[PDB]
């Protein structure tokens, strides 16, 4: 794929989950066979109970963007629109992530199968080492600080805000967030700062 081409097949590839509006187009071309879709989306299926916690409060933090109305059952794309831009922090492209963590309108009743559909979602479970790992020439787990690196040197270019924010918001385990946790992010390890 020439210079021009790999601009086009960000917007044209776009193999789910990559069919999202982007920062200046979504993901850089996967090669011509569609094997790599599986690393574009992973999905599991364990449902977790609502009102069992007391960090359950979180659903009220998200609420406003996903429930304009006071008993919800608002419009069905508005999860897929607004929540993108400051809900689970800034910058839109949360389209297919949102359409795969909500199976129609979200509200307090519906919450069991979104909390559950977090664990289906995109790049959830189905944990595999090799995906990010093969970058650094297969040497050690491929974590946060090398991703930031790569974004300013190689690869297709995307909005720098999101990355500097993401490093700062790190929990820190000490070798950062490995590929394991980049998938397995639903079970432990999340973000800080503004939003949802």
């Amino acid at each position: 794929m020439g210079d021009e081409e790999k601009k086009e097949k960000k917007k044209k590839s776009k193999k789910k989950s990559e069919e999202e509006g982007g920062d200046a187009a979504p993901a850089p071309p996967p090669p011509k066979p569609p094997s790599q879709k599986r690393r574009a989306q992973r999905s599991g299926s364990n449902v977790f109970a609502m009102f069992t916690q007391h960090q359950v409060q979180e659903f009220k933090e998200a609420f406003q963007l996903i429930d304009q109305d006071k008993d919800g059952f608002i419009s069905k794309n508005d999860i897929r629109a607004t929540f993108d831009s400051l809900g689970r922090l800034c910058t839109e492209q949360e389209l297919d992530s949102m359409v795969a963590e909500a199976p129609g309108p979200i509200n307090f009743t519906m919450f069991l199968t979104i909390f559950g559909d977090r664990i289906a979602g995109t790049d959830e479970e189905d944990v595999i080492v090799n995906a990010f790992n093969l970058f650094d020439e297969g040497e050690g787990k491929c974590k946060e600080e090398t991703l930031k690196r790569s974004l300013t040197t190689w690869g297709e270019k995307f909005s720098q805000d999101e990355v500097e924010e993401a490093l700062s918001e790190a929990p820190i385990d000490g070798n950062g967030l490995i590929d394991i946790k980049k998938f397995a992010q639903i079970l432990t390890k999340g973000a800080e700062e503004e939003g949802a």
């Binding site: 210079d3 790999k6 850089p28 790599q36 690393r39 090799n130 690869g155």
Partner: protein
Amino acid sequence: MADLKAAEVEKAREHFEIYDWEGEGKIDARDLGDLLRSLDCKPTLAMVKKNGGSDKRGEKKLTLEEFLPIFSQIKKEKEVGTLEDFMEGLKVYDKAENGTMLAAELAHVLLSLGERLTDIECEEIMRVCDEDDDGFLKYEPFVKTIIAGPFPDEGK
């Protein structure tokens, strides 16, 4: 063989997309070499240098837009090769009666035939089992990891 057809264009875009890494759609001069080989035109190193390629470090960057009016010439006179031929061929050497191959021995027979293996490639044939006891391959996982390419892309 094959003429200019959608399927070849895909083959060429796919190899190219592996061969970049910059995300800028630019591959160096030398990479014309192994692109054409993967496409199954079966060039020689002469055919590479004819197309201003190299077996040294790059000199300049190529876009696909340059590469393709080279390539539509290259396709003429080629065999896409079979797979089953290399299996049958490599069954000839045995070392257990199971199609197993000592590494040095497999480098040496290639060296001494054909256009003749270089110092470097015999190190690469050897590389797998290097410097231990020498060092047994098996024909089936050998040919197969070569043709498949080592991660053209995977879903894992």
